[PDB]
Design a protein around this nucleic acid. Structure first.
Ligand SMILES: [Mg+2]
Ligand SMILES: [Mg+2]
Ligand SMILES: [Mg+2]
Ligand SMILES: [Mg+2]
Ligand SMILES: [Mg+2]
Ligand SMILES: [Mg+2]
Ligand SMILES: [Mg+2]
Ligand SMILES: [Mg+2]
Ligand SMILES: [Mg+2]
Ligand SMILES: [Mg+2]
Ligand SMILES: [Mg+2]
Ligand SMILES: [Mg+2]
Ligand SMILES: [Mg+2]
Ligand SMILES: [Mg+2]
Ligand SMILES: [Mg+2]
Ligand SMILES: [Mg+2]
Ligand SMILES: [Mg+2]
Ligand SMILES: [Mg+2]
Ligand SMILES: [Mg+2]
Ligand SMILES: [Mg+2]
Ligand SMILES: [Mg+2]
Ligand SMILES: [Mg+2]
Lengths: 167, 260, 134, 185
RNA sequence: AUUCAUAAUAACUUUUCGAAUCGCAUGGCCUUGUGCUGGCGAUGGUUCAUUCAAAUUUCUGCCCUAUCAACUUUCGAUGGUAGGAUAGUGGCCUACCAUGGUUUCAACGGGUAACGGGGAAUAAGGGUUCGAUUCCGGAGAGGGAGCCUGAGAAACGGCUACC
RNA sequence: UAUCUGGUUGAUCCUGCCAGUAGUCAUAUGCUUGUCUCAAAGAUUAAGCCAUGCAUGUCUAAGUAUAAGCAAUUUAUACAGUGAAACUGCGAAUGGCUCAUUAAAUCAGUUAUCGUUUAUUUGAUAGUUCCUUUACUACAUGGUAUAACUGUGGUAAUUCUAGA
């Protein structure tokens, strides 16, 4: 049952320290690595099943491979993904084109659809303008606090220079 | 080892919390916050053990999650929030205001203040320094960073903080004759006026303090907190005013006002 | 009749938990351990809210008999009683139902069994069925 | 992990196990006071040892010592409160002179006997153990209770005792039932 | 007490950060455009403070043993200069250099049926014995070593290898 | 709670130990055991070895919901309730156990960091984003690539995983 690993130019099984983001390993902790035995990439009699992908169709239609088509499980969820899936434009209304799936419970046929992500909304723009206005008003408040401190230092300097120069 | 500790065993908590020896293996471990662990009073200890408004921690959490309590004008839903010296605790229900001041036995007292007193606190200036962009700032005893302080403000002085805006209203210097409050050591909770301050350059400045009845004591400067001028504090003192009666006279007034 | 003469001391109003809390000391000479039900009803009339919103607990009786001391809670309405009272006390008063849950060991063992499955596991069941069938 | 509960031993045993003088004096105390053990005498002698030690180092301290004044007055107050030390002779020199018979005089068993009410120390003890005496309104079934000189006028028969009222007693009830059975209605 | 805080100049960089995020309410205004402004929070983020700490660190203090009197210095022992490494000081390591360092005031070694302390037992006073063990500190997870993730572990209800 | 007694002699007085005597949160064991309260407890010998089960997970109004999940929802045909799974985030460095190592080492009290790191908490803090500007790039908002899921599998077996 040991799966083949791409890049192991060998026909036998070898132990390897596997890490995050590699095949034949699902890490269970953070930064956790295991040594596992992996079949090499070289196909040979030692195997039990080959996974193959059809790159070019033949002259005959296979009974369960190519004659059939599997419906796509999920449609697009992001706004621009919907835009490029149905090819509308850079600017358009993507709410109309959202794939709605129909679910029946005997009598009530109700339709559910994904929530569009990165959708431009007044809530998003209000948050944008709020962050901008916060930055500008904090900078102005900083400038006026510095100015108030500056005139305080100038007054204190005038006090001390006059007191020390005359006394 | 290997990292920060999250538990506080009972018998290792600060003694001034007055937690019972039995009925529990642990004590509330104060969260990180404005006051040091040993010098703080967690909100659960205040609400449950001192004010008796809650019978257990679950009720303390129930009270806090409805946002009744507030420390220095902010809700603080945290159960183990480390409230400390001169913190203002407001309960909008019961319309009650508290300032955390030690009584003369070195324990936080249930001391009530009015709305006008609860509008502000006092902070001891822990440090004065120039920040980035050359902007001066002071750091108080409760960790508050206050930008653009008055240049006359030095370390060991006391500032009045608006507590609505984090702003200094006025300040008191550290000089002989000024009323101070002892916030540490074995004289914790005593109130008197500075007689003089001996330097000891290189370590541990000392302060000589005498109270109303001319009892003098010497305390390290780190424990000394200025609270006003000669008389007339800027805060409402608790009962006792830090006099430190002896046990004999303490007993005398016990038998005096217990027999009417 | 037998002078139950319930009285409540150390009364504290707790608007934070929307209730009144107090000690309940009960004089019951020629009697033993009156009840929690009749203490609750009597506290219901004396504080004039409801029997539902009155909670009593504690009630150790003095050595030798004739007196018991406990603690009492009177809430400002039933709904806040159901909000702040513990589940076990509400089940004591019939105001709640003791939730049907499995044994502590059974829950822990089920949790440790479900740790061995990744995903929903119905793919694993399908493959196990098909492998055994064929 | 929890705070240990504190406990202490309340007696010491004597030095020489077999002194005819101590054995006779202990048995005379036990007989005169209706005690069960020699441990009952040992517990009192142990209490004298702690009291005498505390008074001893206080007297080592000079007069007007704040600690000698404070602790010596509290020790005098407690012993006067319990009746072991007389209302006069309120001094540390006098608490040093206290005897075992002074403490045994203040036991509830002795006080129940000496306030009438028992006609014997052994009768007093069985009445006490059998819940017939209330020191105030509180039934006390411990014969070593240390009546504290304000409770003496409050010692009486328990209100829920057949010698206090409201019930004629279990054995008396069974016997009266038998008599009703033999006689009639 | 400083080559401190901070500021300035010329540059530099596999250029760091400087909100493409979320809940509730959705008020105000005039070129009424589904236009311009707008609240109470949540979560993020730089840096400095603080809190929790961590690491290192100053002085003095530890049982029996001389049938243990000299020990360390080749493969750092002791100091200097420079560098490297580290979060940072430091022979921590490296190169070069010097010949130092401890010790009869008991070094070095050996033993311990030694984790240390708060404490415990007994005790006129002085003492004697104990403290694996409810709190504090330390160490370890069969024995070694090594490392990943992480603010933080040389982690073991983490991994790697050997025994 | 500053106490001694028996034993060398024919008798004596000494030295001197043996023996007795009393405690022990001091262990074990024997006999015995009615009540209430309190409550130590595989340390010592073996830090010897372990069957089995449990002891670390966690979701708020507030990161990601098309479960082909349940209720069906408050214009709600983008979503809106609850919400498995799985990404994401945080935690798993605390606790708990033991005393094997360890003799200026640990550790105690007392110092220092003007010799450093510090998630979180709390406070404060960000108008400057223009390659070489006299070559600015959607901002009413950039991109792909994956989990859970679909489906096809391998292995006696694992908290194994592969192909699409
Ligand atoms: Mg630990
Ligand atoms: Mg969130
Ligand atoms: Mg060097
Ligand atoms: Mg160097
Ligand atoms: Mg050992
Ligand atoms: Mg020890
Ligand atoms: Mg120990
Ligand atoms: Mg051992
Ligand atoms: Mg470890
Ligand atoms: Mg083992
Ligand atoms: Mg390890
Ligand atoms: Mg384990
Ligand atoms: Mg562990
Ligand atoms: Mg001898
Ligand atoms: Mg019984
Ligand atoms: Mg063992
Ligand atoms: Mg053990
Ligand atoms: Mg466990
Ligand atoms: Mg973590
Ligand atoms: Mg346990
Ligand atoms: Mg154990
Ligand atoms: Mg963190």
């Amino acid at each position: 049952g040991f799966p083949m690993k791409q890049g192991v130019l060998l026909p036998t099984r070898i132990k390897l320290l596997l890490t995050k983001n590699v095949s034949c390993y699902r890490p269970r902790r953070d930064g956790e690595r295991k040594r596992k035995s992996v079949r090499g990439a070289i196909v040979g009699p030692d195997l039990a099943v080959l996974a193959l992908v059809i790159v070019k169709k033949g002259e005959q239609e296979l009974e369960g491979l190519t004659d059939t088509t599997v419906p796509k499980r999920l449609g697009p969820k992001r706004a621009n993904n919907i835009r490029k899936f149905f090819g509308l434009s850079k600017e358009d209304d993507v709410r109309d084109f959202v794939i709605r799936r129909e679910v029946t419970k005997g009598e009530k046929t109700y339709t559910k659809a994904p929530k569009i992500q990165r959708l431009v909304t007044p809530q998003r723009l209000q948050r944008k303008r709020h962050q901008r206005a916060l930055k500008v008003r904090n900078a102005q408040a900083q400038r006026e606090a510095a100015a108030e401190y500056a005139q305080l230092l100038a007054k204190r300097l005038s006090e001390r220079k006059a007191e020390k120069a005359e006394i | 080892a290997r990292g920060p500790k999250k538990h506080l065993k009972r018998l290792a908590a600060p003694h001034h919390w007055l937690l019972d020896k039995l009925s529990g293996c642990y004590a509330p471990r104060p969260s990180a916050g404005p006051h040091k662990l040993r010098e703080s009073l967690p909100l659960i200890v205040f609400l449950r053990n001192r004010l008796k408004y809650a019978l257990n921690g679950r009720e303390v959490k129930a009270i806090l999650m409805q946002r009744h309590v507030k420390v220095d004008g902010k809700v603080r839903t945290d159960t183990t929030y480390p409230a400390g010296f001169m913190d203002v605790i407001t309960l909008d229900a019961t319309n009650e205001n508290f300032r955390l001041v030690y009584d003369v036995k070195g324990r936080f007292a249930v001391h009530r203040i009015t709305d006008e007193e609860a509008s502000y606190k006092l902070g001891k200036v822990k440090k004065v320094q120039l920040g980035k962009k050359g902007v001066p700032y002071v750091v108080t005893h409760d960790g508050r960073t206050i930008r653009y302080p008055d240049p006359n403000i030095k370390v060991n002085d006391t500032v009045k903080i608006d507590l609505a805006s984090g702003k200094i209203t006025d300040f008191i210097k550290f000089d002989a004759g000024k009323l101070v409050y002892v916030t540490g050591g074995r004289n914790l909770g005593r109130i008197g006026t500075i007689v003089h301050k001996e330097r000891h350059d290189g370590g541990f400045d000392l302060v000589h303090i005498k109270d109303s009845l001319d009892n003098t004591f010497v305390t390290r400067l780190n424990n000394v907190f200025v609270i006003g001028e000669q008389g007339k504090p800027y805060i409402s003192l608790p009962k006792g005013k830090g006099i430190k009666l002896s046990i004999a006279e303490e007993r005398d007034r016990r038998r005096a006002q217990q027999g009417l | 009749s037998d002078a139950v003469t319930i009285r409540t001391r150390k009364v504290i109003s707790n608007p934070l938990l929307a209730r009144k809390q107090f000690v309940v000391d009960v004089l019951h000479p020629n009697r033993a351990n009156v009840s929690k039900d009749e203490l609750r009803e009597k506290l219901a009339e004396v504080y004039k809210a409801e029997k539902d919103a009155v909670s009593v607990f504690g009630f150790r009786t003095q050595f030798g008999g004739g007196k018991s001391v406990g603690f009492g809670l009177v809430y400002n309405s039933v709904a806040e009683a159901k909000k702040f009272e513990p589940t076990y006390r509400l089940v004591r008063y019939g105001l709640a139902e003791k939730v049907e849950k499995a044994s502590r060991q059974q829950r822990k063992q089920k949790k440790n069994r479900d740790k061995k499955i990744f995903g929903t596991g119905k793919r694993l069941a399908k493959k196990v069925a098909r492998r055994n069938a064929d | 992990p929890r705070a240990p509960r504190t406990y202490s031993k309340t007696y010491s045993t004597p030095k020489r196990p077999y002194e005819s003088s101590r054995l006779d004096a202990e048995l005379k105390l036990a007989g005169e006071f209706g005690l069960k053990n020699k441990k009952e005498i040992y517990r009192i002698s142990f209490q004298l040892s702690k009291i005498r030690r505390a008074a001893r180092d206080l007297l080592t301290r000079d007069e007007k010592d704040p600690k000698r004044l404070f602790e010596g007055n509290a020790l005098i107050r407690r012993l006067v409160r319990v009746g072991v030390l007389s209302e006069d002779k309120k001094k540390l020199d006098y608490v040093l002179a206290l005897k075992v018979e002074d403490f045994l005089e203040r036991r509830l068993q002795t006080q129940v006997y000496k306030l009438g009410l028992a006609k014997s120390v052994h009768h007093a003890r069985v009445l006490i153990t059998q819940r017939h005496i209330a020191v105030g309104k509180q039934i006390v079934n411990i014969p070593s209770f240390m009546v504290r000189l304000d409770s003496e006028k409050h010692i009486d028969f328990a209100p829920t005792s057949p010698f206090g009222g409201a019930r004629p007693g279990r054995v008396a009830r069974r016997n009266a039932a038998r008599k009703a059975e033999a006689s009639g209605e």
